[PDB]
Amino acid sequence: GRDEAGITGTWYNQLGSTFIVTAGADGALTGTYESAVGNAESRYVLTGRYDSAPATDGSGTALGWTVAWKNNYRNAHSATTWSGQYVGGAEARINTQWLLTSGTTEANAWKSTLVGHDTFTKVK
Amino acid sequence: GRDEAGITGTWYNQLGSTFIVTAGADGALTGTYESAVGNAESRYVLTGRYDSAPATDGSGTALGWTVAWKNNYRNAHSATTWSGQYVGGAEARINTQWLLTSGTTEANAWKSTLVGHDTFTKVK
Amino acid sequence: GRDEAGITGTWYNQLGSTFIVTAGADGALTGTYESAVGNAESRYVLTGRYDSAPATDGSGTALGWTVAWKNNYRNAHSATTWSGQYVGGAEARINTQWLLTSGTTEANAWKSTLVGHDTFTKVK
Amino acid sequence: GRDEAGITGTWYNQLGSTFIVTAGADGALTGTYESAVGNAESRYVLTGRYDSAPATDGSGTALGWTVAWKNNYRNAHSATTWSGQYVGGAEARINTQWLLTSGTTEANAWKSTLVGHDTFTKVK
Ligand SMILES: CN(C)c1ccc2c3c(cccc13)C(=O)N(CCNC(=O)CCCC[C@@H]1SC[C@@H]3NC(=O)N[C@@H]31)C2=O
Ligand SMILES: CN(C)c1ccc2c3c(cccc13)C(=O)N(CCNC(=O)CCCC[C@@H]1SC[C@@H]3NC(=O)N[C@@H]31)C2=O
Ligand SMILES: CN(C)c1ccc2c3c(cccc13)C(=O)N(CCNC(=O)CCCC[C@@H]1SC[C@@H]3NC(=O)N[C@@H]31)C2=O
Ligand SMILES: CN(C)c1ccc2c3c(cccc13)C(=O)N(CCNC(=O)CCCC[C@@H]1SC[C@@H]3NC(=O)N[C@@H]31)C2=O
Three state DSSP letters for C11-68: EEECCCCEEEEEECCCCEEEEEEECCCCCCCCCEEEEEEECCCCCCCCCCEEEEEEEE
Under DSSP, the state recorded for A3 is: H
Which residues of D fall within a CB distance of 8 Å from A17? none
| Residue range(s) defining the domain that contains residue A33 | 1-121
For chain A, breaks with the C atom over 2.5 A from the next N come after none
Report helix, strand or coil for D16. Answer: coil
Give residues with Cβ within 8 angstroms of A112, minimum separation 6: A101, A102, A103, A104, B60, B85, D116
CB count in 10 Å sphere of residue B89:
7
For D114, the closest chain B residue by CA position comes to B97
A103 and D CB contact within 8 Å:
no
Resolution limit in angstroms?
Answer: 1.5
Q: A50 vs B68: CB contact, 8 Å cut-off?
A: yes
Q: Is the dihedral of CA A105, A110, A111, A113 positive or negative?
A: positive
Pocket of ligand 2 (CB under 6 A): B 13, 15, 17, 35, 37-40, 69, 76, 78, 80, 98, 100, 102, 111-112, 114, 116, 118; C 110-111
Burial of D8 (0-12, 13-18, 19+ CB in 10 A): middle
What's the number of domains chain A is made of?
Answer: 1
- Give the angle subtended at the CA of A51 by the CAs of A46 and A53, to the nearest 5°: 145
Asked if residues C21 and C49 have their Cβ atoms less than 8 Å apart, the reply is no
Q: Which helix (H) or strand (E) holds C74?
A: none
Tell whether ligand 3 has an atom less than 6 A from the beta carbon of residue C29: no
Ligand 2, residue B82: give the atom nearest the CA.
28
Known binding residue C82? Answer is yes
Known binding residue C11? Answer is no
B115 and C CB contact within 8 Å:
yes
- Give the angle subtended at the CA of D97 by the CAs of D92 and D103, to the nearest 5°: 135
Asked if residues C50 and C62 have their Cβ atoms less than 8 Å apart, the reply is yes
Q: Residue A6 belongs to a domain with what CATH number? A: 2.40.128.30
Known binding residue D44? Answer is yes
Burial of A91 (0-12, 13-18, 19+ CB in 10 A): exposed
What's at D82, amino acid-wise?
W
How was this one solved?
X-ray
- Give the angle subtended at the CA of B34 by the CAs of B31 and B36, to the nearest 5°: 155
